[PDB]
Amino acid sequence: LYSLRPEHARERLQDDSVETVTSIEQAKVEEKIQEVFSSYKFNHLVPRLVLQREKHFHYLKRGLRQLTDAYECLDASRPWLCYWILHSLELLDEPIPQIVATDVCQFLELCQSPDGGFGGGPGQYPHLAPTYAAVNALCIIGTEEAYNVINREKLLQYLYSLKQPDGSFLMHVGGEVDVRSAYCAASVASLTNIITPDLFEGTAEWIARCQNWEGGIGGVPGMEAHGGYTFCGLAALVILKKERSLNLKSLLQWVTSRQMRFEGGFQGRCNKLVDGCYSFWQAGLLPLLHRALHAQGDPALSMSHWMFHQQALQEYILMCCQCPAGGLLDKPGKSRDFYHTCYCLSGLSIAQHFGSGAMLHDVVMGVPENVLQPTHPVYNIGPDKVIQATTHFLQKPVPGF
Amino acid sequence: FLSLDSPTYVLYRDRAEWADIDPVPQNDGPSPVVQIIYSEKFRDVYDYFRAVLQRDERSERAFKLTRDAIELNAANYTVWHFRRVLLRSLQKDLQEEMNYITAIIEEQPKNYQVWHHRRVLVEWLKDPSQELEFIADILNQDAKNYHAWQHRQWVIQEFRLWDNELQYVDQLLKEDVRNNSVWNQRHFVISNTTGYSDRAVLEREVQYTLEMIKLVPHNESAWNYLKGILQDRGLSRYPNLLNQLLDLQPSHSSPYLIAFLVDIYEDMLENQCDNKEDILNKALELCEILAKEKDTIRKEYWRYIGRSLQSK
C-alpha cells in the first residue's frame, strides 16, 4: 500500500520548529492516522482493504426510513437526507424498492413549494440547497413519477425570484448569497431543461470573481479559496459551458495542492485538516478539469488517470473514514453521518474510475468488491441518471414566457 | 419569557396563554421517509409554530416562540424568516435583537442563517459600529471561521472601514503565520486599498513574505501569497527572484522552493530567454524530482507539467 510503505513516513509534517495552532492540530491528525496505518504491523495480519458494504447498506437502509432525535438539527434538510442515502445506496449498487421510491417521491412532493422549488421539509419555504437535493433524488429514482413531481414552470419562476443583478442568486427569498446558489440553480435548471436565454445572465462572470489569488474559488468575491465552493463554481461553469472564464492553470495547481501528502485525502482550504467529504468536493475537480483542459485541446493530459493520487485517496477512505457499524466519516474519531457517507463514497468512486473519451482505467483498491457504481462529476449522481433525466425533460419545451 | 432549559419549563400544549390555538402537526405523509423522531419538546414547539405561522399570527407570543423554535433548530431558515417579519411588523427594538443574534452566533458560529440574520439587522440599522469587535471575538475562538471572515469583508467593503484592518491582519499573522484566512485577508485589504502596483508596496510585501518563508520554509500560505502577488506581472520580470530563492535551496528548502522555481522557469520560457534549452532541462529535472522523490502525492500533476513543458 502506498501509505503503509516506509518512505511515506517522510511525508510527515515539517514543523520548522516554529509551531503554531495549525502545526499542532495537523500533527495531531497525522499521529491518529499513523496509528491506523500501522494498525496492521502491530497486530500481525495481512492488510485487507474492504468496503463494509453490507454494514453500510444496513445503516443507509434504516436512515431512509427514520432517524433519532439526534437528527433534529437537519430537520430543515430532509431532501438532503433522501439524496445522501439514495445516492450512497446508488453507489453501493443497492436496491431502491418500487414502494420506497414512491414514498420518497410523495414526500418530496410535500416539500415542494407552490411557488416552485423545495423546502427542507413539509411546509418549509423553498431553498436552493433542498431544491438541488430533491431534484437529484428524483433523478436517482428516475421514473415518470419521480420526474413528474418536479414543477418546471414553477421552478423557473422561483429561480428567477432569486436572481441578482450582479449575476448571483439568493439561496432563498430573504436569504444569503454565495456560490452554492449558482451551482444549485444551474444543476436543477439544466437537468429539468428550464434554462432560458437570460436566466444565468452574468452568472459566469460573478462566479469568476470568486476565484482569488490562490487559484481557488471562494464563497463570494474576495473570500478564501474553499473546496466546497470551488466545486460549486467550477461545476457551475462546466454546466454553463464557461469553465474558460477562469484561470484553469492556477485552479489546477491549487486543487492538486489540497491533497495531503501524508494522509492521502484532501483538505478544504490551504493549511486546514483532511476531511473525508472533500474526497469529492476537491477530488471531483480534476475530472471536471480534465474535460475542461482537453476541451481546449490539451496534449499533456493522461489517458488513464486523474491529476491526483487515486491510490492514496482510496487508502485514506478505506482505511481511515469507514465506520465499523456502518457509515463513513470525516476522519478517525469523528462521528458518522449520511453526508460524509454520501461524500466519502462519491470520492472513492471518483478515485476508482477514470475516463477520457473511450479510455477507461478504473483503479480499485483492495477487495475488487470495493468498486462502486460511477458518479457524474458535475451532478454527483450516476452518469446514467443524468443522461436519462436531461433527455426526458428535453422533450418538454423550456418554460418560455 | 420561559427558557427551554428552565427546570420549570412547560409544554405549549400545557400553557394557559396558548389554548386558543390548535397545534398544527407536521404532515410527512401516510408513509414517511427520513422521518425524525422528535422529542415531545421539539414536536410541541413546532406543532405550535406550524399554527402561528399558518395563521400568520404576527404576535408577540408568536415572536417569543420562534425563539424557542430557533433554539431547537437554529438551522431552520423558515422560522428565521418569519422572525424577521415579526421584527418589522411588531416593530421590535433591533439593537435588542442585535444582542440576541450576538449570543446565538457565539453558540453556532458556523450556522448560515445566524450570520445572514445579523447582516440584515446591520443593514436595517445602517450601523457597522459593533461588527469588527464582534467578529474579532469570534475569530478569537476560531481564527478561521469562514462565515466570520466573510461577514467581516462585507462590513469593511460596504461601510468602507479599511483603515485599521491591515494592522489586524498583522496581529493575527503574528499569532499563527500559517493562518491562510489572514494571508487571504491581507490580500483582500491591500488589493482594495493601495494595490500591489506601487513599487514600494510590492517590495515591502515580497520582503515580508520572503521573511515568513525564510522563517517557516514549509508553511505553504506564505509561498502561495508570494507567488500570488508576483505571478500577476510575471515572475520572470524579477531577475533577482530566481537567485534569492536559489540561495534558499539548502537553507530553507521544501518542495515549495522547487515548485516555485519550476514556476519561474515556466515564465522565463513563456517570455523566451537565452539558455532556454538548459532552463527547460533544469525545470524538467525539478519536475521529475518533485514527481519521483520530492512530492509524489501529486506525481500525476508533476509529470503533466513535465509534458506540457515539452509542447510549450
Ligand SMILES: N#CC1=C(c2cccc3ccccc23)CN(C(=O)Cc2cncn2Cc2ccc(C#N)cc2)CC1
Ligand atoms: N451531514 C452532515 C453535516 C452537516 C450538513 C447537513 C446538511 C447538508 C450539508 C451539506 C454540506 C455540508 C454539511 C451538511 C453540517 N455540519 C456542519 O455544519 C459542520 C461542517 C463539517 N464539515 C463542513 N462543515 C461546514 C458546512 C456546514 C453547512 C453546509 C451547508 N449547506 C456546508 C458546510 C456537520 C454535519
Ligand SMILES: CC(C)CCC[C@@H](C)CCCC(C)C[C@@H](O)P(=O)(O)O
Ligand atoms: C452544493 C453544496 C451545498 C455544496 C456545499 C459545499 C460545502 C461543503 C461548503 C462548506 C461551507 C463552509 C464555509 C464551511 C466552513 O464552515 P468549514 O471549511 O469550516 O467546513
Ligand SMILES: [Zn+2]
Ligand atoms: Zn467533512
